[PDB]
Amino acid sequence: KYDIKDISLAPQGRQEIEWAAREMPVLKQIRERFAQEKPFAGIRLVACCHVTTETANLAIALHAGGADSLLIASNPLSTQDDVAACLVADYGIPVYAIKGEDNETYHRHVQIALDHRPNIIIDDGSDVVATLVQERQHQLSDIIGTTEETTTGIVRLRAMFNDGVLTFPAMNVNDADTKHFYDNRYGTGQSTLDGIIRATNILLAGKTIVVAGYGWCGKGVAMRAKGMGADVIVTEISPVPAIEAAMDGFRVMPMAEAAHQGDIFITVTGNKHVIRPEHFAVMKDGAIVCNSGHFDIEIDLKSLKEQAKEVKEVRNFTEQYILPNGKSIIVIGEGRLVNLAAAEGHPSAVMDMSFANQALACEHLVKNKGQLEPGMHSIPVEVDQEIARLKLQAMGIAIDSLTPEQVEYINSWASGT
Amino acid sequence: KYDIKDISLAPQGRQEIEWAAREMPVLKQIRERFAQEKPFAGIRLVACCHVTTETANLAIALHAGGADSLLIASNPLSTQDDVAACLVADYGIPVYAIKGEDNETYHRHVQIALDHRPNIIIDDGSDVVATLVQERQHQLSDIIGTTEETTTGIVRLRAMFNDGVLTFPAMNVNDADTKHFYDNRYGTGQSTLDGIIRATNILLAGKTIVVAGYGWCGKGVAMRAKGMGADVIVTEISPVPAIEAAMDGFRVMPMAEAAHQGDIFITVTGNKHVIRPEHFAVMKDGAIVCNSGHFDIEIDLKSLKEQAKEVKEVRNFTEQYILPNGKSIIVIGEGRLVNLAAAEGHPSAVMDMSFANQALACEHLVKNKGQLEPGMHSIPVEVDQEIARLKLQAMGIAIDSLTPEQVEYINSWASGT
Amino acid sequence: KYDIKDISLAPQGRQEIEWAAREMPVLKQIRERFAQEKPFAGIRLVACCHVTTETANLAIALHAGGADSLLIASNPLSTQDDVAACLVADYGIPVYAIKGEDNETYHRHVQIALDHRPNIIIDDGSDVVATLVQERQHQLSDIIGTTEETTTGIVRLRAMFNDGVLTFPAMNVNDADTKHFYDNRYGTGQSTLDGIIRATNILLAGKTIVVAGYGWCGKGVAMRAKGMGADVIVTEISPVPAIEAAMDGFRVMPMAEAAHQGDIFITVTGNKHVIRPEHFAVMKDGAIVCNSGHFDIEIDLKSLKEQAKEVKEVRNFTEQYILPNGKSIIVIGEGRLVNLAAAEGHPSAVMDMSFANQALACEHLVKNKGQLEPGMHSIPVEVDQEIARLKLQAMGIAIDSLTPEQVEYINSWA
Amino acid sequence: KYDIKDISLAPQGRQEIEWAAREMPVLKQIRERFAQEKPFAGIRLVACCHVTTETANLAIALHAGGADSLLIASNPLSTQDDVAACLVADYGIPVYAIKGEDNETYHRHVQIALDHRPNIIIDDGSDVVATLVQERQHQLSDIIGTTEETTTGIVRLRAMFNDGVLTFPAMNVNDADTKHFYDNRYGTGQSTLDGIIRATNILLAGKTIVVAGYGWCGKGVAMRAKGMGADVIVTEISPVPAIEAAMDGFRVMPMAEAAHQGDIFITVTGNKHVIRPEHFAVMKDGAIVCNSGHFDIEIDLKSLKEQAKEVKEVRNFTEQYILPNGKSIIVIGEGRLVNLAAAEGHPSAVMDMSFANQALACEHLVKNKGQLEPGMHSIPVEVDQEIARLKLQAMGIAIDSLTPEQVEYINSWA
Numbered sequence A, B: 001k002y003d004i005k006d007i008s009l010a011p012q013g014r015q016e017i018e019w020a021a022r023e024m025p026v027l028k029q030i031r032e033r034f035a036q037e038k039p040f041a042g043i044r045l046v047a048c049c050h051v052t053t054e055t056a057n058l059a060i061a062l063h064a065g066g067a068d069s070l071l072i073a074s075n076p077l078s079t080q081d082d083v084a085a086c087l088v089a090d091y092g093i094p095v096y097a098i099k100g101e102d103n104e105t106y107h108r109h110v111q112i113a114l115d116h117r118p119n120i121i122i123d124d125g126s127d128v129v130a131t132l133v134q135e136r137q138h139q140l141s142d143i144i145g146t147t148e149e150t151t152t153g154i155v156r157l158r159a160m161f162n163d164g165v166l167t168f169p170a171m172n173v174n175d176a177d178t179k180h181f182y183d184n185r186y187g188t189g190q191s192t193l194d195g196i197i198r199a200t201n202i203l204l205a206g207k208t209i210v211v212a213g214y215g216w217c218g219k220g221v222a223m224r225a226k227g228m229g230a231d232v233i234v235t236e237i238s239p240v241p242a243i244e245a246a247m248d249g250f251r252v253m254p255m256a257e258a259a260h261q262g263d264i265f266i267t268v269t270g271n272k273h274v275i276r277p278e279h280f281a282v283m284k285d286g287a288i289v290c291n292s293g294h295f296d297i298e299i300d301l302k303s304l305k306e307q308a309k310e311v312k313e314v315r316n317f318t319e320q321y322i323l324p325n326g327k328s329i330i331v332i333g334e335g336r337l338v339n340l341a342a343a344e345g346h347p348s349a350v351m352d353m354s355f356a357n358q359a360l361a362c363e364h365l366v367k368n369k370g371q372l373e374p375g376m377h378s379i380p381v382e383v384d385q386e387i388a389r390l391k392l393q394a395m396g397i398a399i400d401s402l403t404p405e406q407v408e409y410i411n412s413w414a415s416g417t
Numbered sequence C, D: 001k002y003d004i005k006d007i008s009l010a011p012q013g014r015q016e017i018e019w020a021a022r023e024m025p026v027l028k029q030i031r032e033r034f035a036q037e038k039p040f041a042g043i044r045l046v047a048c049c050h051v052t053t054e055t056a057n058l059a060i061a062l063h064a065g066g067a068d069s070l071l072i073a074s075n076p077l078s079t080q081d082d083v084a085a086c087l088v089a090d091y092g093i094p095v096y097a098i099k100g101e102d103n104e105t106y107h108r109h110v111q112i113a114l115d116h117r118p119n120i121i122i123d124d125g126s127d128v129v130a131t132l133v134q135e136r137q138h139q140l141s142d143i144i145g146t147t148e149e150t151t152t153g154i155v156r157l158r159a160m161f162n163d164g165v166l167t168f169p170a171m172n173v174n175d176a177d178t179k180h181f182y183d184n185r186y187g188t189g190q191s192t193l194d195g196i197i198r199a200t201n202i203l204l205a206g207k208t209i210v211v212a213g214y215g216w217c218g219k220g221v222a223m224r225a226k227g228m229g230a231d232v233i234v235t236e237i238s239p240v241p242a243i244e245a246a247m248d249g250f251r252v253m254p255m256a257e258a259a260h261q262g263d264i265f266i267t268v269t270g271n272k273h274v275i276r277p278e279h280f281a282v283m284k285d286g287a288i289v290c291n292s293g294h295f296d297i298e299i300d301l302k303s304l305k306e307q308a309k310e311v312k313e314v315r316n317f318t319e320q321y322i323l324p325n326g327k328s329i330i331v332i333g334e335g336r337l338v339n340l341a342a343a344e345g346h347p348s349a350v351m352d353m354s355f356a357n358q359a360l361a362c363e364h365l366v367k368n369k370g371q372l373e374p375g376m377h378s379i380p381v382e383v384d385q386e387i388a389r390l391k392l393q394a395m396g397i398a399i400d401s402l403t404p405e406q407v408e409y410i411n412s413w414a
């Protein structure tokens, strides 16, 4: 069984997946080894991911390794229906994912996924792992381990750990060097603006753009907003990233001060209610708000809907809320990750490395079953470094190597004058 | 006793030190607390640092804390003679440092410094700590601990540790967030180009600039070279920084390929012989080479002097080597850190944080004497974070703070859908 | 009446036109003056433009001015069918424009437009004016004047003038300060990369991108490619813009040297066959070629078709040509204007100033009928400056004004 | 004979002049043609320029051309004393220029220069030409023509023309493509920040920097300030450059709003009193003000002096004004050209093209004696283009050339 929009989209989905593969050579090399070695023979796997052409290439690599996989959507609005159709029709992979599905459907998919009795859970935001631990304690004996794709899910796993309920190994994929140094920064930077421009066709040049958060994602978004000619305001809660943002040329201020000035607001904090009613109240007429953090809770949309006297779709992915004072607030993507909701997410070039990490993390869990302590686990350095070497080579870039004389110099300490 | 160029420069040096203090408010606040609390009462201290207006403000803060300090130069060419005169004449601090001193003099200063029988050694490159361990094993009982300012010295300390001879605590100042995130990146970026432009008055726009190394320093130099209109080539030995440099818009290649194309070469690798005779051989006529890593050994200057049939000073800090084929290679600063040799080093704004870390690391060593294991020690997070908070405040920048509702959200794991 | 795809798209086109109008405040003010003063009463007008939400707002303003207008597509791939439906159904403006129309349909539409016997012709690339001068010498008595939107069209008019056949006033809209300083530069800079990304979802960071031409468009394309993390090569034929590109941090080289290195090629020259058979042969496997200058002839696609053993459609707006050695060349938008073929063209903020220039140029032609010398006329300085003043004000930006003593000091020399 | 600081500096000045010549290949080629053709034989010439290693290379080229030249300083703070020594001692060129000379010495030098009875005057800011027109109406019969190096001077000449006293040809060197596209933009962009950093060693990253003016100089200053990590505010009086600055990512606002926010203020307007008493009163404690336009009058330093209770010299080229409330305002270079007062002026790469224009303009004036209309003359296009071609070639950059079919296609319109 499966639950998708339209099985007839599989031929289009097959073509989209092959296009995306053009820039996933590291994952393709992993798939080919998996086809030989079958690391997941006999393993049941659940993946809660954005159902995109990039996720399909990861699902196909796990299929080649022998995994009995079931895929559900990580977000109601990021699903690519033609991809879902292709995975069902061409690979026989159960997919429960419909673009635009409601909340009841999403939760029912999570339940169907746990009924698959997975041994490995690939999660993106930790919804499925949190549901497992809260509602399916009786299933924990099935678990070899889990993996977590994104920053928000890592925070949830720490909270699970500190609550004493992370009773199995969980691979921190997000914090691998070849994941958040490129995916979170360069990918979010391009695809966030992609989603905004597809939604609105607004000229970014000459606009004031407010980026909440200056971590890996915020650095990318601010960098690319600036590259497209915007005046960039950064907000923060920590002084180290705040100083960095100033020395990168951006204006740093509290959100209450930014709210008067922004034309476009982008949240990338991983936090709740970063943009609040006290902020909507002072925004310019026609201000655009959107979110590129994992959950929409970064913008208090519930309060906006309550205050507004009217909402209407004015363009694809674009809603205009009209406030009782007659001013309007424009929301893109209903507050969901704008790159995936209004565009196609990150280019496959960065997802190659992110999903290479996912594939090898799953292999790590199986090859080390019964030898990993419960709790969080970093990607092994050798694996992280090998992904980077292979990606650099596939990009056609050559670099230098240390000579034996340089190796000797590093190990020396008496010399230097 | 002391060993300086000219005591009569103290009035000029006093004015230079006060100017530099305009942007060192975090260190000034530390000095004022030190004046009250006298943490270094009865402590003998040796500092091997670049004798600059920034180092003077740190020396004055240690003096206010009661330290019996002696200062020697970290590099023969970075000394500011008027600063040396002021510290001797106005504070009575022994300074052994002459701009342009030869190697015999430098080594004799190191010996005089160890004869001071220090309890704390502040080192910049680890020369004095390596000399202590190799030649003064009988003095180790004096040592409360040491600190290390820069990346090259950290590498030496690891080699000492792995050789089993790091038998005392050593504070890793360089790797504090408020040190290498700003000093190594934003400071080196501006002051490296400062030194090059003061030496030559070359238009950087339209030149090809080759940056060897894409760590904290290389990121800054490349960023600012690009900001000044240069075509930037990056060389590397590791794939993670190499990919970053490409996604930042720079051309990544092996040095053998870069050597044909560069107009200006800047080494910031911390490594030996990054630019070798096989590279000089193919450089454009008039190519400029310089170094911003701690030691000049990054450029094989010994071989260049041997091949050249002639050398002459053509401008301040600027030497033209003429090769037997009649082509010329231009060397700035005799291969020594070009920012300090041809200009004035980093602006005091970043050295405020670097030397705030130095001052509190020394206080940490004394307040925890007899409770630190031998080996390397990171700056405590609370200290690192407090420097950043105080610097952000002194820069006049305000940011947000987490509400209790957001704190609750972070500690929650069942919520998120 | 009209020739369009589906009139049932009119309500969607209306919503799209209204969305675009949000950032066309200057043209809005012009439309409202036009509806009162009716400067185009009794005037027939043909517009040959990209049939976009921005052109619609222009057509709506001319219609408010009394103009009996007829619109045809400047390019078969840039037409927005919902916009064509809205203009016909909501405004009664005849539109001859179907997205994807073939060449015969295009040329038929141009003949239908000339049968309107226009007094004013707004052109984009000069196709209709050249046809008029060539085939309809008897209709020149109708012509009060024409306008030309784009750089390629200005060059063709210059050739028309030098040939001695430019026997009427033509307003050079493209060279207005408030046109090519912004439209050609910032407009093309964003919308060109927009089209590439919508076609391919390729990561620009880390790629070598080759920009042919460093005029207004190339400056904009190179600036935004750099801002998205790309390594930028520029090619040129003139030394002055070539030195600018180097001092802007870009590599400058002949296209034959760049052909071995680029991952993405963008032509913005206005000239013919800038990317040539001998470049395709040495390109990297999977290199992308696209064009942002007015006509697709910037790329020698005919040669690529005969060099390739196979061509497949692999993504929207994207063709993969496979050469006998198995290497691929990717073409976006069949070589037509990549911003308008694979995306939506310039954001309406810049089209506000370009189309304010069109509207006031048409007013200029009518208010000066029988008084203008034949040939090309630049936009009047006061018109151009007042557009900039209205736009800056609409952007919410305030600037300074000289004091009486500062004005005095300018006019002193002692 | 001459009036200089110390002739014993000649050998050091020679080494400095030779170093600068390395990146003046175009002027080198001109000098070598001049030494053969001797276009200035029997011609007397006055040059009022910044006495730098770059101006020396110009003077050396004119001397090779047979010119009987006399050089005086354009600005008391920009003079390089070793260069003045080398020109006198090694070339026998009379130089009247001492770094730090007072106002009376400057005006005396200008009178000495006019007593040379020059046939050609090379000016920078138009001080000597205006004095000639004002006080030496009897000497106009000597004048074959003059040249003007900088934007401020072109404005003064326009006022001279409109007043009716520009009774001779003046070559507009500043507006040559190969002059203000590079000198004014990339030259001032680097050398202005160079002067600030040499004066203060302040970190630019993290600072708000206010650039008054977004012409060629302001574009360059803003571009490089941004590249060094600064938050850039731009002020303007014209909407067209104001919209450019916004679309370049900069904040645009009136100077009175910027005065509360800037850490560093840079004036590049050519106008009088752009930073005013009411701005000083609201500036942040320790704000830095400096000027990069030709004259120091861009900043109302007289008002600052009367608002301050105290002034101290705290660094080279740096004054600290302390206001009654204890807040400080920092002035660099006494408000004179910060790049030339606190550093060395433009790198010689761009002065190569500016001074190639000077040299060929002087040749133009002499080769066209008695044939030129009175008034201002632009640099001839072929001169300007050939300078760009020689410079690009000297930079080692190769570009493309149109093929015969591409030339054909330009000239077709059908």
Ligand SMILES: NC(=O)c1ccc[n+]([C@@H]2O[C@H](COP(=O)([O-])OP(=O)(O)OC[C@H]3O[C@@H](n4cnc5c(N)ncnc54)[C@H](O)[C@@H]3O)[C@@H](O)[C@H]2O)c1
Binding pocket: A150, A151, A152, A153, A180, A183, A184, A188, A212, A213, A214, A215, A216, A217, A218, A235, A236, A237, A238, A241, A268, A269, A270, A271, A274, A292, A293, A294, A295, A337, A338, A339, A340, A346, B400, B402
């Ligand atoms: N849309 C995408 O494709 C995509 C990709 C990767 C990650 N993400 C998501 O983006 C979010 C950010 O991830 P990251 O890797 O940048 O995290 P990060 O830990 O590197 O950075 C988050 C930053 O936000 C700051 N911050 C926290 N609360 C804030 C507040 N109230 N106001 C302002 N700043 C605040 C923190 O100080 C920190 O610097 C997460 O939800 C992550 O899951 C999205």
Ligand SMILES: NC(=O)c1ccc[n+]([C@@H]2O[C@H](COP(=O)([O-])OP(=O)(O)OC[C@H]3O[C@@H](n4cnc5c(N)ncnc54)[C@H](O)[C@@H]3O)[C@@H](O)[C@H]2O)c1
Binding pocket: A400, A402, B150, B151, B152, B153, B180, B183, B184, B188, B212, B213, B214, B215, B216, B217, B218, B235, B236, B237, B238, B241, B268, B269, B270, B271, B274, B292, B293, B294, B295, B337, B338, B339, B340, B346
């Ligand atoms: N001049 C200054 O004021 C200043 C300031 C801080 C540090 N430094 C010095 O600069 C140097 C670099 O410090 P950092 O903090 O950037 O170190 P880092 O560890 O952050 O980076 C060094 C980088 O160089 C690369 N590398 C090593 N050998 C290489 C080689 N042969 N070719 C190319 N790349 C190579 C490494 O892969 C790494 O990415 C050190 O000597 C440090 O002491 C100088």
Ligand SMILES: NC(=O)c1ccc[n+]([C@@H]2O[C@H](COP(=O)([O-])OP(=O)(O)OC[C@H]3O[C@@H](n4cnc5c(N)ncnc54)[C@H](O)[C@@H]3O)[C@@H](O)[C@H]2O)c1
Binding pocket: C150, C151, C152, C153, C180, C183, C184, C188, C212, C213, C214, C215, C216, C217, C218, C235, C236, C237, C238, C241, C268, C269, C270, C271, C274, C292, C293, C294, C295, C337, C338, C339, C340, C346, D400, D402
């Ligand atoms: N797609 C769009 O939305 C859009 C917008 C505006 C203009 N355009 C088109 O873009 C083209 C260029 O317009 P522009 O305003 O930048 O023109 P321009 O005259 O300002 O600049 C064109 C540049 O191309 C250079 N060039 C010419 N032939 C060349 C060749 N063979 N190789 C390399 N460089 C060459 C020229 O020297 C010049 O610098 C025109 O066809 C114009 O109609 C398109």
Ligand SMILES: NC(=O)c1ccc[n+]([C@@H]2O[C@H](COP(=O)([O-])OP(=O)(O)OC[C@H]3O[C@@H](n4cnc5c(N)ncnc54)[C@H](O)[C@@H]3O)[C@@H](O)[C@H]2O)c1
Binding pocket: C400, C402, D150, D151, D152, D153, D180, D183, D184, D188, D212, D213, D214, D215, D216, D217, D218, D235, D236, D237, D238, D241, D268, D269, D270, D271, D274, D292, D293, D294, D295, D337, D338, D339, D340, D346
């Ligand atoms: N220091 C140097 O080496 C150097 C080099 C070249 C030119 N200059 C000088 O720089 C100045 C400017 O030259 P340019 O070529 O950029 O001139 P420009 O004519 O191209 O630009 C000047 C700009 O300043 C603006 N402006 C005028 N008054 C203003 C005011 N009160 N407030 C704000 N903006 C105002 C104008 O609108 C214009 O955009 C001149 O004095 C020129 O002589 C100095």
Ligand SMILES: Nc1ncnc2c1ncn2[C@@H]1O[C@H](CO)[C@@H](O)[C@H]1O
Binding pocket: A050, A051, A052, A053, A054, A055, A074, A124, A125, A149, A150, A151, A183, A294, A337, A340, A344, A345, A346, A347, A351, A354
């Ligand atoms: N194209 C994509 N396909 C799948 N996952 C994606 C894509 N773009 C972004 N993501 C992932 O979504 C996560 C946020 O939910 C990020 O960690 C990122 O890796």
Ligand SMILES: Nc1ncnc2c1ncn2[C@@H]1O[C@H](CO)[C@@H](O)[C@H]1O
Binding pocket: B050, B051, B052, B053, B054, B055, B074, B124, B125, B149, B150, B151, B183, B294, B337, B340, B344, B345, B346, B347, B351, B354
């Ligand atoms: N102005 C300066 N004064 C003192 N030390 C400096 C200065 N500029 C750079 N340094 C230091 O020199 C070290 C390299 O030897 C760097 O770690 C850096 O912190």
Ligand SMILES: Nc1ncnc2c1ncn2[C@@H]1O[C@H](CO)[C@@H](O)[C@H]1O
Binding pocket: C049, C050, C052, C053, C054, C055, C124, C125, C149, C150, C151, C183, C294, C340, C344, C345, C346, C347, C351, C354
């Ligand atoms: N959205 C758009 N609507 C109409 N014309 C456009 C649009 N984007 C670009 N153009 C115009 O198309 C011309 C190229 O033929 C450019 O001169 C430009 O003004």
Ligand SMILES: Nc1ncnc2c1ncn2[C@@H]1O[C@H](CO)[C@@H](O)[C@H]1O
Binding pocket: D049, D050, D052, D053, D054, D055, D124, D125, D149, D150, D151, D183, D294, D340, D344, D345, D346, D347, D351, D354
């Ligand atoms: N190094 C220099 N030598 C001579 N003139 C210079 C130099 N730097 C800038 N200038 C000139 O000074 C003028 C300003 O008066 C500018 O037009 C510029 O051409």
Ligand SMILES: [Cl-]
Binding pocket: A030, A033
């Ligand atoms: Cl592998």
Ligand SMILES: [Cl-]
Binding pocket: B030, B033
């Ligand atoms: Cl403290």
Ligand SMILES: [Cl-]
Binding pocket: C029, C030, C033
């Ligand atoms: Cl109007």
Ligand SMILES: [Cl-]
Binding pocket: D029, D030, D033
């Ligand atoms: Cl010549």
Ligand SMILES: [Rb+]
Binding pocket: A016, A020, A052, A053, A054, A344, C201
């Ligand atoms: Rb896709």
Ligand SMILES: [Rb+]
Binding pocket: A305, A306, A307, A308, A309, A310
């Ligand atoms: Rb409501």
Ligand SMILES: [Rb+]
Binding pocket: A409, A410, A412, A413, A414, A415, A416, B156
């Ligand atoms: Rb060593």
Ligand SMILES: [Rb+]
Binding pocket: B016, B020, B052, B053, B054, B344, D201
């Ligand atoms: Rb100093």
